[PDB]
Design a protein around this ligand. Structure first.
Ligand SMILES: Nc1ncnc2c1ncn2[C@@H]1O[C@H](COP(=O)(O)OP(=O)(O)OC[C@H]2O[C@@H](O)[C@H](O)[C@@H]2O)[C@@H](O)[C@H]1O
Ligand SMILES: Nc1ncnc2c1ncn2[C@@H]1O[C@H](COP(=O)(O)OP(=O)(O)OC[C@H]2O[C@@H](O)[C@H](O)[C@@H]2O)[C@@H](O)[C@H]1O
Ligand SMILES: COc1ccc(CC(N)=O)cc1OC
Ligand SMILES: COc1ccc(CC(N)=O)cc1OC
Ligand SMILES: [Fe+3]
Ligand SMILES: [Fe+3]
Lengths: 384, 383
């Protein structure tokens, strides 16, 4: 009956926020960092924005940049290997979900060595010790990996993404700095932006929802719906709004759950390596329609903060307005409307529906999802 | 760039103290010193926690010497008990007074150079985190469980001083209306308007930004909605108040308050006035004073406080916001004038000077002069 909230003890918000990291490291007396990132962020000079400030304050660092989209067991093991031979006593996550989730796995397994197979971390990880201290710097807007107690690792052998949930993995400090995010191509702003929206909407209507998370989620929907078109077009101010809104969504959904969008999205990541945000975006409006009659008054709120005039609308009419508002936003930021558009195969749907039913996220969905329900949703989402 | 310090872990709702035994075992702590006051031992509130700790086999000693507006003496005495207790962590059970006493003890224990206590004033230059604190509020009230601030009374200099330190943040908060139900109506009323003050002052403070604005406006809405119900003794309203007071804490701790708290602290020092009653009497008068320096923010306050602001000009809505606060104060049975609770006309000059010097006053959106604070005390005083 009582509800738990895990949050960052310390976080810095706004352009220039990464400038606070050298001070926070010195006040905690940490000796050497392993920075967990990917190739693109080294090559575009984003990592250098941090390693330059660390050089100027005389703080030692090694780099692991082997992280691929939808990080694998292989990538976790390889990164853990580098951390142990680096002599580091803390971690700095620089990137979107992929590096930040890779970083959490490494930080957990280092101080809980019985999980070295990594796949045994799935579900409520029964870890005894806190993670290696993590300092988190997101470069997408965003997975909110910096504030959530969750991370998603791809099992190549079993061809599935598995969710690990553990209060021990919470970063010590987050640095939410739109300066780190500006380099996102439009399509990445669009995808990660609707991933943030999905978190906010799924979180708002999830079974575990209560007053505090409702307050956070509805605020994040308002910020994201307001700013995402601006940000994809390349507006400085909208990009900062998105940086905050994606985080506020994290503060909610981490603590209560999401639903069938994330459940149906994870198999698409496993099977095709589909960007998490694109899969969520295509699925979100179809799953909202499916969930509609099981969400009380909450679609009125979604539609209103998304710019629709809901006064004088009936409950069912407002529920349609909320779904149409999400279709419209997807059209406007250039996310295709059908799963076949991103190479999902008609024949896989049975195996996809089964993976979706078994995914941790699906138990939070407000309408109780059957195998045949998920099959029909994939089909409706696949073509017209 | 703006910083947010929050609880890493907190539990919300009736029964939330049921999670403590689990949280202590997962952190491997051996023995607690519970910091509380006599009333909370006598009303069986402390026993609700020590019973659950007995059943899980977790050791505890108790310090119950905390008085309202905790003193340097009380901090020193409590620190003495903690060192001779063999405890390795702290459990705060009470409102601001025990929770603030507990933070001082936890800080000074691991930063022994502050044993005089009064050297903690301002941004405490502490090197080491506090002794781990687990916080259980029994008032709907100070948000001591989530803020990086604590207020200690200096008897010798006759002033309350604010200590601000990220090292004092509790590890876990337990926000449990079950622990709060035993508040007499007048205590629910006072601590409830202290929460409102935090929310309103925090909303309009100089350091305010989007995230704290979002928290504060939600807390104003919850408190304005629930406080009448809670004081009358409604179970559900008491839980709403328990959440709303906390959400206010998540904001103001990180950005600041203003001239209400600045003017309230001297009234605590001079007369031992309950913090919530002083804030309540002052709040509407300081809002009127601040009105012309708060942009559009009083529209928002008035709207979430149940006023229809759509047809209203800016100045008309600013008045509606102030009248909404007067009405709520009247309704929960708070005396409406400072003279009613024994504030003396002759002290106002010394009161105004203490207010000008208080840390809280630098956050106020309108820059306050000595003469301004003098005039505010006078207008707040009249029978
Ligand atoms: N600022 C940036 N500028 C340009 N490219 C960037 C930037 N930040 C990241 N990228 C690139 O975007 C691509 C996607 O990066 P991810 O980290 O995979 O993206 P994100 O959506 O943040 O994370 C998805 C991952 O997180 C999990 O929640 C989810 O299930 C999935 O595993 C990569 O090529 C990465 O290098
Ligand atoms: N649940 C309760 N049931 C009964 N009595 C209670 C309860 N909670 C508190 N009390 C009693 O109410 C009185 C006031 O307690 P405080 O802790 O002083 O109340 P609060 O308003 O929470 O604390 C204010 C303090 O915090 C600082 O911010 C402020 O400067 C001031 O020192 C005391 O006698 C205390 O025992
Ligand atoms: C169960 O809640 C979660 C579901 C999915 C994720 C990964 C993500 N960012 O989408 C994290 C979670 O938090 C515990
Ligand atoms: C300067 O900020 C503060 C002003 C007042 C207090 C005490 C209170 N809660 O009434 C705490 C503060 O810091 C968190
Ligand atoms: Fe996601
Ligand atoms: Fe206060």
């Amino acid at each position: 009956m009582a509800n738990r909230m895990i949050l960052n003890e310390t976080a810095w918000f706004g352009r220039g926020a990464v400038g606070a990291l050298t001070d926070e490291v010195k006040r905690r007396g940490y000796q050497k960092a392993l920075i967990v990132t990917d190739k693109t962020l080294v090559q575009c000079g984003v990592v250098a924005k941090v390693t330059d400030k660390m050089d100027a304050a005389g703080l030692a660092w090694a780099i692991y940049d082997g992280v691929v989209p939808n990080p694998t067991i292989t990538v976790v093991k390889e990164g853990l290997g580098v951390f142990q031979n680096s002599g580091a006593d803390y971690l700095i996550a620089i990137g979107g979900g992929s590096p930040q989730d890779t970083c959490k796995a490494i930080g957990i397994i280092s101080n809980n060595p019985e999980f070295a197979d990594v796949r045994s971390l799935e579900g409520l990880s029964p870890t005894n010790k806190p993670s290696v201290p993590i300092l988190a710097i997101p470069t997408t807007a965003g997975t909110a990996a910096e504030v959530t107690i969750g991370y998603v690792i791809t099992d190549e052998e079993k061809r599935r993404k598995f969710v690990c949930v553990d209060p021990h993995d919470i970063p010590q400090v987050a640095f939410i700095d739109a300066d780190m995010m500006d380099g996102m191509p439009p399509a990445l702003k669009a995808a990660t932006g609707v991933d943030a929206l999905t978190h906010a909407i799924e979180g708002y209507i999830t079974r575990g929802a209560w007053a505090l998370t409702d307050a956070l989620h509805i605020k994040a929907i308002e910020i994201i719906a307001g700013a995402l078109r601006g940000s994809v077009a390349g507006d400085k101010d909208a990009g900062e709004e998105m940086a905050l809104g994606q985080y506020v969504a994290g503060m909610g959904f981490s603590n209560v759950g999401v639903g069938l969008v994330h459940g149906m999205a994870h198999p698409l990541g496993a099977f095709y390596n589909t960007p998490h945000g694109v899969a969520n975006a295509i699925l979100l409006p179809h799953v909202m329609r499916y969930n509609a009659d099981f969400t009380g008054e909450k679609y009125r709120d979604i539609a209103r903060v998304m710019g629709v005039k809901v006064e004088g609308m009936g409950l069912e009419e407002a529920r349609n307005a909320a779904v149409e508002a999400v279709f419209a936003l997807n059209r406007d930021v250039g996310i295709p409307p059908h799963l076949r558009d991103v190479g999902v195969r008609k024949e896989d749907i049975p195996a996809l529906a089964q993976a979706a039913l078994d995914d941790v996220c699906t138990g939070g969905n407000p309408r109780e999802a059957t195998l045949e329900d998920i099959v029909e949703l994939y089909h409706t989402a696949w073509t017209s």
